[PDB]
Amino acid sequence: PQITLWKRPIVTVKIGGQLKEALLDTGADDTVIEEMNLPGKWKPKIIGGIGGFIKVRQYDQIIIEIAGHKAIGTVLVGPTPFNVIGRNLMTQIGATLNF
Amino acid sequence: PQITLWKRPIVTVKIGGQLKEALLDTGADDTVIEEMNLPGKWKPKIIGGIGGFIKVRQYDQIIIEIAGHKAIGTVLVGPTPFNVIGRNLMTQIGATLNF
Numbered sequence: 676p677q678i679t680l681w682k683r684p685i686v687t688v689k690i691g692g693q694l695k696e697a698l699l700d701t702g703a704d705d706t707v708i709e710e711m712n713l714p715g716k717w718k719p720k721i722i723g724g725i726g727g728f729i730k731v732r733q734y735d736q737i738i739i740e741i742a743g744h745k746a747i748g749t750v751l752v753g754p755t756p757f758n759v760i761g762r763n764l765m766t767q768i769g770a771t772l773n774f
Numbered sequence: 775p776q777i778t779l780w781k782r783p784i785v786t787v788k789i790g791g792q793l794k795e796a797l798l799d800t801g802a803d804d805t806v807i808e809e810m811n812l813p814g815k816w817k818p819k820i821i822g823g824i825g826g827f828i829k830v831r832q833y834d835q836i837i838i839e840i841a842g843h844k845a846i847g848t849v850l851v852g853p854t855p856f857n858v859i860g861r862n863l864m865t866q867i868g869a870t871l872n873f
């Protein structure tokens with residue numbers, strides 16, 4: 676699709692077998708999802724945004740389906756009220772910025 | 775252009791007579807630039823994201839060239855960890871997310 680930027684670029688994604696809403700964020704290195712149980716082992720990570728740093732749990736080889744594309748890679752689980760899809764997964768589905 | 779997301783989508787921007795590097799940031803409502811001098815009056819604004827909030831000064835109708843494309847709009851100036859171009863100016867240059 677071509678997503679315009681009049682509003683926040685929030686789309687539906689599939690994680691854990693369920694549909695969720697997440698913002699496609701070209702300014703995010705990483706994918707960060709609100710608290711939830713994921714399969715497997717995790718490692719601590721610290722990530723920084725506009726207001727400073729938070730601690731999150733890093734899960735590897737997590738599948739998130741986006742527009743029919745299966746991206747697989749690192750997903751961070753943190754205390755955020757939303758889901759952010761970062762570049763690490765958007766690269767896998769072929770997402771580009773165009774102007 | 776068409777910009778892939780394997781690296782941070784950082785472009786050259788011209789603002790206030792200076793060249794700066796800035797991140798094309800679909801996860802930003804606003805455009806936020808490190809401390810600098812801008813013409814005109816300003817209003818206080820509080821903006822937030824990961825880690826919490828920072829205090830910034832809002833300047834309106836600022837001329838800014840983004841990768842060779844003209845935009846005139848609101849620029850927020852404050853202690854941002856990173857210079858970001860937000861949706862408010864990316865829409866002006868016709869930027870879309872595509873996959």
Ligand SMILES: COC(=O)N[C@H](C(=O)N[C@@H](Cc1ccccc1)[C@@H](O)CN(Cc1ccc(-c2ccccn2)cc1)NC(=O)[C@@H](NC(=O)OC)C(C)(C)C)C(C)(C)C
Pocket residue numbers: 683685697698700701702703704705706707722723724725726757758759761799800801802803804805806821822823824854855856858860
């Ligand atoms: C290397 O660091 C990062 O990549 N940091 C990322 C990050 O915070 N990205 C920022 C840009 C940035 C990068 C590095 C340091 C400082 C800032 C944004 O891409 C995402 N971010 C955090 C963010 C992500 C998703 C959402 C959101 C909203 C509705 C539904 C789903 N998500 C809101 C804020 N957005 C904001 O903070 C914006 N806030 C904003 O627009 O608030 C309305 C600002 C900028 C205008 C302040 C993550 C922590 C998400 C991985």
